[PDB]
Design a protein around this ligand. Structure first.
Ligand SMILES: [Mg+2]
Ligand SMILES: [Mg+2]
Ligand SMILES: [Mg+2]
Lengths: 152, 65, 143, 102, 142, 72, 212, 184, 71
RNA sequence: CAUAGGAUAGGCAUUCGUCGAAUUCUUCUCUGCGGGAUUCCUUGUAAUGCACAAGGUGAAAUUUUGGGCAACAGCAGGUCUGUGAUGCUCCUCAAUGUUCUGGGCGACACGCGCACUACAAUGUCAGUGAGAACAAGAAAAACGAGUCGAACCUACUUGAUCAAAAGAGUGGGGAAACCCCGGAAUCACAUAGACUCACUUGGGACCGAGGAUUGCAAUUAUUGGUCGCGCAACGAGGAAUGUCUCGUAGGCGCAGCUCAUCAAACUGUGCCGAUUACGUCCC
């Protein structure tokens, strides 16, 4: 009996569930709905110049922009460049020491642009990106689903 | 192999100081012939007194100093 | 009609974890907002749990503990949190409870690991010139 | 109030306290309702050169440091009353700076 | 992939005059032909409708004839212009993408172009020397 | 040498569903040299036997997964 | 924006470092001994410490007048902003910077090296100094250079407290045959007000007090 | 409610004893919720004998530059090791380890003290060299092998626990003792 | 925590001469006297002087100490 | 109660650009002077003494840790390539002065120091999570509007009905105030992800073709990025050899410094975090 209320606590939100379980179900929600606007570049391109080959998951633009949607819930006011530090890599240079590179803000611009067209992100009052009230409804309702194990 | 107890550490021996000269009491089963027998033997490794160790051939004694 | 609240701290290297222990209707211990069933490595969730486990689950019965940690990286934020919790129980029993109920559960912490309560004073030693680190020198070559 | 902030910066640790405590002991006599002198973090300045002017020897170094001491005091007096608090011949090497907050 | 082996599974398939180890995955055996590499073999498996999970020897003859025209003529399949090997091609001017035997052929035609005129980057290949800004005092050792 | 197959033959997949649930301590490297298949198949062949409940998953991580027989 | 407080402590140090070099070259035979400058609104003070205040001042202040406007034209001060003063050292025997410039002139006037250096140490140790040390290095005797040191009294050298108690200055003497360098170290005695010497005792002197 | 820790919330420390009565003080059987503890066991001379024996396996895995500092890995890598040891032996795996440490190192050895005289081995070094020679050898087994490290480590611990000669340590434990018997 | 320098030992005998009556077998009270009877700047030496003073108070309970000049 | 779904706390349920109001605080933060550690206490060594070992006490236990500073003599060590430090001596108007222009310092049969990258599955890849400390940052008696601008670093938007790298707007910051809740990398992950022991999806040397930035100038590629090449050795290294005793070695990155553009360097800083010894005079 793994799913039940613990004591008096009656609901869930983000940071009350697993981070991957939220992102995987949010990625699952986006393609099952179909209203997402996946760009044509996501077939050809690579997530950064620090990655050495293509993301090799056909749902990777769904898993990204669900991770990004979680990364607006935490840190409102985050821009494209603050997200590039979140998804950056340690790049393999050949015979030289490895240095950290921040990810291409291009795909992070498409990721926020898709989530605005859902209505889940608002462009912020003065800073970068803000979660709309529909997004708070979406992020928490989906996070209650993953504790009662309704992953779909 | 008989289990003997270190009752005395007689100082660091050898050239490089890695070997330790001890005085080991043999700790037999008290009805035995070789009970309460004490031997002066060389121990390799970190050894404090009251440290039990196993002995293959107990009839040898090391040359002291 | 009252507020029973206690703030404690823990430090390991640079991780300073401030645990705000207060009385609530339900036990709810969460480190930076993560509810301690969800601290991700099962190894480091077990070091934060033995702040609760060596003393008993009964003593954290209706206590809401909020551990806010900053500094010092992944493993040092577990020893900062598990010390902020274990100090947090005891400073909740320095007030609000008598000395007989404490100082048994203080010594249950001290018998298990000395670093549930005091601190680990070890910091990084500075790099010096002529050395790659605190101690390792440049390579001498002779020929 | 006008909320004038005086910035006491100095290179000497014994001269920055002998100004700030003297400047504060002036601003108690007019009952100004100050917000107390805070100690902003001291900034040390490292120049780590070689010791040798030539090239050889063991490659020895020497780090030089220079600490800047930094204090601010907020006081609600008008702008010619804070010039009464400010005007006194200080020690050499201590800079004071009058700033009006909002 | 929890599926049985087919009867026609070649351990070595031959595509673009190149032997290709059919025991490997389908892009990573398709990079064995020159000119392809990993970053382009995932685009040949994507434009041909080939599942990347399958092994290269299960590719049938109708699937291998579709691969060879994605590699010979990739601009008809909307693989973009920046993705190709030979993009502005001096003495031709047209964007190409060079196949197995053609990479080494026009490499020799480029080293001969820079040696007909006495350009310095062609003089370095005549003497066998390093061509870019390497020092080549302590590290050639050939 | 160590030439392993990269897909199942019909003969060796029948070895997968019969002999492997009788083993104790099934791992994808135990199956890789007993059945002469690559570990990428051996790990895939053992995930199939868990959902049919023929073997048990006794220890799981992202890399290392240890399986055992079910005793009933 | 204005420069940062980190950028202004730099330019205020390079101000004092350049002002110190100019006056060390000018006032060498005036017995120069240091500068303190005090900056405020309406005026920038510069106080010059010397041993010969009739010479660093001119006949009517002529010498300091020229020496004022050399600092004005260089550092781009305006009229009224820059005022200079001369104070004299009260002792002259506790200032290592003055004594080394005199020992520079005792050699350049072709006196004997050892007669000159003991004339310093006799004058320094009669002036209340706890100790003194004069080192003359160079071609003293002939073609090949020597080093001689001449010593009397205490001298603390290994502590970092010797910056508080020991006054030092080194100059060059340009002989006809080469270059001689002279050094003068003077251990400051007393002066709890900080006239010449620290207030606190030496770091190892305990001095148990007597009971009433 | 002090629920007396198992080890990974699975394996109890209740029944541990040592066959070697020479090595009881130096093999520590105190309980832990994980191998990792971050304590200073190296200040005093014999204090690392008070370190729990399951931690000392995790410290022996952190070798060769590809492993220096990866203790959370070695705790994970030992988590799957101890579960495999349960499947090979059908016993408490921690007793299998204490039986492996007790048999893993030679009781006698030979050094030059003055000729090449045979010298007894202290109980502290016999706990060190047993842990050392089992992490070694399991490391060299899995170096270009199909087998994972939690299998090769689990095989060295089992075969040394039985005293079989298939273990790497027991080949060297018997080579050193027969050389020491001939260098008497 | 090793041998006391003669700076510590000569000063500690002078505290026992001038202030024998104000001192007993405790460190933490003898330290507070020596801060008022010794004008030195270091707290490290004043800890060492109060350690060797306490030592030669236990020696004066037994018998005579050489060089003590108690008079 | 996941497609197959384990292990693991529990008077008033919980969560916060929500760019809320209030009204009480110093727990953490900053920091000028100051406490605290002394062999202090204890019971064997030693035998008066100076002290020593083990344990206590404690935040810290023996130079507390880590550095700085270091006498006296001397070396025919290095520096006349640091100085408007210098003596002697050479050159001194087609000058060995000083400036331009173009080369060179970097050239490669080779021999050596020092790093860097690896030889793989305790891994490579592609994801996803948690999450550091030291630090830097713009300008002149110039050119512009005695006051202010622009040079410097940066978030944020844009570019974007479509690759990076860019290119542009718009804010902010004189630096505890903006970057910044400094989203470093090791690591982590029950990721039900690909590879499966191969010179291989290890390794990334070599060089081919677009393109864009720094500069007055890129050829003897300045640097980044894209797709090729990868069939270049390399499978753990002969004789020899270097550094190290605890937050250490090793691994990991990040700043600063050189810097218009360029770190396999050095000076610093944090992160993960051991093996062994606590000995000896064998070399
Ligand atoms: Mg060197
Ligand atoms: Mg005048
Ligand atoms: Mg060889």
């Amino acid at each position: 009996n793994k799913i039940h209320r613990i004591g008096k606590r009656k609901g869930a939100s983000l940071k009350d569930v697993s981070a991957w379980r939220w992102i995987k179900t949010a990625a699952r929600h986006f393609k099952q709905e179909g209203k997402i606007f996946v760009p044509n570049c996501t077939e050809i391109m690579k997530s950064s110049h620090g990655r050495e080959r293509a993301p090799q998951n056909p749902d990777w633009y769904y898993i990204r922009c669900a991770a990004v949607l979680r990364a607006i819930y935490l840190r409102p006011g985050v821009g494209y460049g603050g997200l590039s530090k979140r998804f950056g890599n340690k790049k393999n240079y050949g015979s030289r020491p490895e240095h950290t590179v921040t990810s291409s803000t291009g795909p992070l611009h498409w990721a926020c642009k898709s989530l605005t067209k859902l209505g889940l992100v608002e462009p912020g009052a003065q800073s970068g990106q803000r979660l709309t009230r529909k997004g708070h409804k979406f992020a928490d309702s989906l996070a209650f689903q993953v504790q009662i194990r309704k992953f779909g | 192999a008989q289990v003997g107890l270190i009752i005395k550490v007689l100082g660091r021996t050898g050239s490089r100081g890695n070997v330790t000269q001890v005085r080991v009491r043999l700790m037999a089963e008290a009805g035995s012939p070789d009970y309460n027998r004490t031997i002066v033997r060389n121990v390799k490794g970190p050894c404090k007194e009251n440290d039990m160790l196993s002995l293959m051939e107990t009839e040898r004694e090391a040359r002291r100093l | 009609y009252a507020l029973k609240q206690v703030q404690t701290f823990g430090k390991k290297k640079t991780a300073i974890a401030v645990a705000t222990v207060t009385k609530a209707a339900q036990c709810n211990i969460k480190v930076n907002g993560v509810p301690l069933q969800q601290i991700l490595p099962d190894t480091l969730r077990a070091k934060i749990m033995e702040a609760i486990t060596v003393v008993g689950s009964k003593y954290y019965s209706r206590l809401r503990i909020d551990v806010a940690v900053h500094g010092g990286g992944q493993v040092s934020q577990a020893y900062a949190a598990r010390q902020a919790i274990a100090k947090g129980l005891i400073a909740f029993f320095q007030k609000y409870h008598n000395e007989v109920e404490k100082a048994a559960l203080k010594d249950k912490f001290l018998a298990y690991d000395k670093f549930l309560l005091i601190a680990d004073p070890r910091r990084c030693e500075p790099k010096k010139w002529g050395r790659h680190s605190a101690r390792t020198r440049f390579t001498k070559s002779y020929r | 109030g006008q909320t004038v902030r005086l910035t006491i910066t100095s290179r000497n640790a014994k001269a920055v306290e002998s100004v700030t405590s003297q400047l504060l002991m002036r601003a108690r006599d007019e009952k100004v309702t100050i917000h107390g002198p805070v100690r902003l973090p001291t900034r040390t300045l490292k120049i780590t050169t070689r010791k040798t002017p030539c090239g050889n020897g063991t490659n020895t170094w020497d780090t030089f440091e220079l600490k800047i001491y930094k204090r601010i005091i907020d006081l609600h007096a008008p702008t010619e009353q804070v010039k009464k608090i400010t005007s006194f011949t200080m020690e050499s090497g201590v800079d004071v700076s009058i700033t009006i907050l909002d | 992939s929890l599926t049985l082996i087919p009867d026609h599974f070649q351990h070595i398939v031959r595509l673009l005059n190149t032997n290709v180890e059919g025991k490997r995955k389908v892009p990573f055996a398709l990079r064995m032909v020159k000119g392809v590499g990993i970053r382009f073999a995932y685009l040949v498996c994507k434009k041909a409708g080939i599942d990347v999970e399958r092994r290269a020897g299960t590719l049938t003859a109708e699937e291998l004839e579709k691969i060879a025209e994605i590699i010979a003529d990739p601009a008809k399949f909307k693989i973009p212009d920046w993705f190709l090997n030979r993009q502005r091609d001096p003495k031709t001017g047209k964007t190409e993408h060079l196949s197995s035997s053609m990479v080494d052929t026009r490499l020799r035609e480029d080293l001969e172009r820079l040696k007909k005129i006495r350009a310095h980057r062609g003089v370095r290949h005549a003497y066998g020397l390093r061509v870019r800004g390497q020092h080549t005092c302590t590290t050639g050792r050939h | 040498a160590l030439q392993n197959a990269v897909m199942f033959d019909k003969e060796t997949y029948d070895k997968l569903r019969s002999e492997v649930p009788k083993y104790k301590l099934i791992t994808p490297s135990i199956i890789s040299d007993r059945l002469k298949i690559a570990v990428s198949i051996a790990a895939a062949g053992l995930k199939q036997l868990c959902r049919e409940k023929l073997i048990r998953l006794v220890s799981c991580s992202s890399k290392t997964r240890v399986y055992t027989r079910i005793v009933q | 924006g204005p420069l940062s407080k980190k950028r202004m402590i730099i330019r205020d140090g390079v101000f004092y470092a350049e002002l110190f070099e100019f006056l060390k070259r000018e006032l060498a035979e005036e017995g120069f001994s240091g500068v303190s400058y005090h900056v405020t609104t309406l005026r920038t003070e510069i106080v010059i410490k010397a041993t010969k205040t009739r010479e660093v001042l001119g006949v009517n202040g002529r010498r300091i007048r020229e020496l004022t406007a050399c600092i004005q034209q260089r550092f781009n001060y305006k009229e009224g902003k820059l005022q200079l003063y001369v104070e004299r050292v009260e002792v002259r025997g506790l200032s290592a910077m003055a004594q080394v410039e005199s020992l520079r002139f005792k050699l350049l006037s072709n006196l004997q090296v050892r007669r000159a250096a003991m004339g310093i140490i006799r004058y320094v140790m009669e002036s209340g100094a706890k100790g003194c040390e004069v080192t003359v290095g160079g071609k003293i005797k002939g073609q090949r250079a020597k080093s001689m040191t001449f010593r009397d009294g205490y001298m603390i050298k290994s502590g970092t407290a010797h910056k508080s108690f020991v006054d030092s200055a080194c100059r060059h003497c340009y002989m006809r045959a080469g270059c001689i360098g002279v050094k003068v170290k003077i251990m400051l005695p007393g002066d709890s007000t900080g006239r010449n010497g620290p207030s606190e005792p030496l770091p190892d002197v305990i001095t148990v007090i007597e009971p009433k | 409610s002090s629920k007396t820790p198992k080890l990974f919330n699975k394996w109890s420390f209740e029944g541990l004893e040592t066959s070697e009565l020479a090595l009881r003080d130096h093999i520590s059987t105190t309980a832990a919720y994980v191998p990792h503890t971050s304590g200073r066991w190296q200040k005093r001379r014999f204090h690392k004998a008070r370190m729990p024996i399951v931690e000392r396996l995790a410290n022996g895995l952190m070798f060769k530059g590809r492993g220096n500092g990866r203790k959370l890995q070695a705790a994970r890598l030992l988590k799957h090791t101890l579960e495999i040891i349960h499947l090979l032996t059908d016993e408490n795996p921690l007793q299998v380890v204490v039986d492996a440490v007790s048999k893993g190192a030679p009781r006698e050895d030979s050094t030059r003290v003055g000729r090449r005289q045979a010298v007894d081995v202290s109980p502290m070094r016999r706990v060190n060299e047993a842990i050392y020679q089992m992490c070694k050898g399991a490391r060299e087994a899995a170096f270009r092998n199909l087998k994972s490290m939690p299998e090769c480590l689990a095989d060295e611990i089992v075969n040394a626990s039985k005293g079989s000669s298939n273990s790497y340590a027991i080949k060297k434990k018997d080579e050193v003792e027969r050389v020491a018997k001939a260098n008497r | 925590g090793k041998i006391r320098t003669k700076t510590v030992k000569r000063a500690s005998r002078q505290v026992v001469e001038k202030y024998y009556s104000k001192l007993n077998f405790d460190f933490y009270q003898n330290k507070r006297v020596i801060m008022d009877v010794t004008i030195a700047e270091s707290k490290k030496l004043k800890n060492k002087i109060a350690g060797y003073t306490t030592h030669i108070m236990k020696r004066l309970a037994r018998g005579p100490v050489r060089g003590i000049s108690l008079k």
